[PDB]
């Protein structure tokens, strides 16, 4: 019995749209007292400045100590330099949670913000937020206020094909973790990067490919080991059905040889001639083992392709 | 350099379906004790009367002081007079939140109500509710109980074309504000109109049109929108509001610095006359720094 090397490939669109500056407007909210929306200012609690007249700030509540709570979204127009890259994390802007103590009952329960831009064709992404201004007690962790952002998206047409822009979530700058809920202490602000991605089709999906490594094996056969990289000398044990991190993405390989590989890397991180290599070990009914490689090309392609 | 008037148009379906009386049934819920559903009665906490045998009321909890908490939905069959108008706020009924103090742990966490109606084609809209019966303390605002309604919908066919009925949310009667969450004090009831809309297609969408006002303007080219406003302000020219939501008579405009715009009809169809026109003004600036002003006239056509 002999395991035979397996090949595969996956295409990742690597390309960009030309886009305008983006413009954010808080359009709707539920509940709250003294709710206002406005274009950001350098007033103390004004949220800072942006290059447009969209109302990027929202505030609520009667302050009990200083300022009103709310949200603010400062776009990333400068650094985006007129471009959206495909299959690439995009910092659309920086979202700040202003949590102050307001008299109880005075806060919204939810709100939505529009982000508009042209591709000329205007496109509007709608963002949704659930808000929990928690009753404040002596326990400061329980007193934190909580935001939940939806994973919304918008599909739009370009040169006759569909693209989807999709909300991924919030990120502490300089970190890698995306969250979909934020917790913020009272009398504090919390700024995060709103991360989005855009790619082809009617929803956003990470590029992926699937196969079976036992299909071309020679002999019952069962995958008993898998790993990133080339480990043929040693063979491999375990990790069957676990997520296996490679250079550009993740592999899951099941005991019956079926696998899915998913490209998670930013397109910018993927060179030409990119190949992802895994090792697997197979066992036959006799109990004999054999090891081979699964090699996957990760091909950068244009929107035209 | 010269800004040139721009024209556009948007169609709004203005029409109605013939429909039956609607019938509401609470079909499912999660958690809670002593949970009952029933057709409303004039018992004290019975929810009031409706013309049908659907179970429009739901209750839960062991009362600690008087009554059980719950929800009730009284349909608007009488005033709807057998008709759903398109692109028109529809009061499907009145939703009441009954919040009473019940022994802790006794309330549902969620529930679902069906609203069925013929159009003769039977149609069912499913509504979903998340429920938070909050632990009661000395702080009465924190002690309020909270309801969240989903923006669900149903698509159905009529004379070979698709229509969607869509939940908009809750409204205090005699007000214009829709909310998607309700907060209700303990030992209180809270009644809200439940607002829906129906229109053509597979989801509900406000009628809309898009364009670019700089496309026909004269200037090499370096043109930028620097002002926008509702109405005719050509004498003065306009400054600011580029990328803001600009309210007109029938809807909202957003116009970006590169001339691209979207106009969206929010008005009830009933509020839109024949020969309806929406007028905006914009001011453009060219690379020289010279400004010019013109109009964007968007027809709102009832079809």
């Amino acid at each position: 019995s002999t395991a035979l090397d397996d090949r595969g490939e996956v295409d990742i669109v690597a390309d960009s749209f030309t886009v305008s500056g983006v413009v954010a407007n808080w359009t709707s909210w539920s509940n709250g007292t003294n709710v206002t929306t406005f274009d950001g200012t350098n007033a103390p609690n004004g949220g800072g400045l942006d290059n447009d007249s969209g109302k990027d700030q929202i505030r609520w509540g009667q302050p009990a100590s200083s300022y009103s709570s709310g949200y603010g979204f400062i776009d990333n127009d400068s650094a985006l330099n007129g471009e959206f890259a495909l299959n690439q994390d995009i910092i659309l802007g920086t979202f700040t949670h202003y949590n102050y103590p307001v008299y109880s009952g005075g806060a919204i329960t939810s709100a939505s913000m529009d982000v508009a831009f042209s591709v000329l064709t205007p496109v509007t992404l709608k963002l949704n937020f659930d808000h929990n201004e928690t009753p404040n007690t002596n326990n400061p962790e329980a007193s934190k206020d909580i935001i939940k952002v939806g994973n919304t998206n918008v599909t739009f047409e370009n040169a006759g094909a569909l693209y989807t822009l999709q909300v991924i979530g919030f990120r502490i700058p300089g970190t890698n973790q995306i969250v979909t809920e934020i917790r913020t202490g009272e009398n504090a602000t919390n700024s995060y990067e709103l991360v989005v991605r855009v790619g082809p089709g009617e929803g956003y999906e990470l590029p992926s490919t699937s196969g079976n490594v036992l299909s071309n094996d020679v002999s019952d056969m069962t995958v008993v080991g898998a790993a990133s990289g080339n480990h043929v000398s040693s063979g491999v044990s375990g990790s069957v059905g676990s997520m296996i991190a490679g250079l550009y993405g993740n592999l899951i390989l099941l005991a019956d040889g079926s696998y899915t590989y998913q490209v998670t890397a930013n397109a910018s991180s993927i060179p030409n001639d990119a190949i992802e290599i895994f090792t697997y070990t197979m066992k036959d009914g006799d109990g004999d083992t054999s090891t081979a490689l699964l090699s996957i090309n990760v091909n950068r392609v244009t929107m035209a392709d | 350099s010269t800004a040139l008037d721009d024209r556009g148009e948007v169609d709004i379906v203005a029409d109605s379906f013939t429909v039956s009386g609607v019938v509401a049934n609470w079909t499912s819920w999660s958690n809670g004790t002593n949970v009952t559903t029933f057709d409303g009665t004039n018992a004290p906490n019975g929810g009031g009367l409706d013309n049908d045998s659907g179970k429009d009321q739901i209750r839960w909890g062991q009362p600690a002081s008087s009554y059980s908490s719950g929800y009730g939905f009284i349909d608007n069959d009488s005033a709807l007079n057998g008709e759903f108008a398109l692109n028109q706020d529809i009061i499907l009924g009145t939703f009441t939140h009954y919040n009473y103090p019940v022994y802790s742990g006794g309330a549902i966490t969620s529930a679902s109500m069906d609203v069925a109606f013929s159009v003769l084609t039977p149609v069912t809209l499913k509504l979903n509710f998340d429920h938070n019966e909050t632990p009661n303390t000395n702080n009465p605002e924190a002690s309020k109980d909270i309801i969240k309604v989903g923006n669900t919908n149903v698509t159905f066919e009529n004379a070979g074309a698709l229509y969607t009925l869509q939940v908009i949310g809750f409204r205090i009667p005699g007000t214009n504000q829709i909310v998607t969450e309700i907060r209700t004090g303990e030992n209180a009831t809270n009644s809200y109109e439940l607002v829906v809309r129906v229109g053509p297609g597979e989801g509900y969408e406000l009628p809309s049109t898009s364009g670019n006002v700089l496309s026909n303007d004269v200037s090499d080219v370096d043109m930028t929108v620097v002002g926008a406003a509702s109405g005719n302000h050509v004498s003065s020219g306009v400054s600011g509001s580029v990328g803001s939501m600009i309210a007109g008579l029938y809807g909202n405009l957003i116009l970006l610095a590169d001339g691209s715009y979207t106009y969206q009809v929010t008005a009830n169809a009933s509020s839109i006359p024949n020969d309806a026109i929406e007028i905006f003004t914009y001011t453009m600036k060219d690379g020289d720094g010279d400004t010019s002003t013109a109009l964007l006239s968007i027809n709102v056509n009832r079809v």
Binding site: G61, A64, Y103, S104, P135, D145 | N139, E141
Partner: peptide
């Protein structure tokens, strides 16, 4: 004087 409760706050949220």
């Amino acid at each position: 004087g409760w706050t949220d």
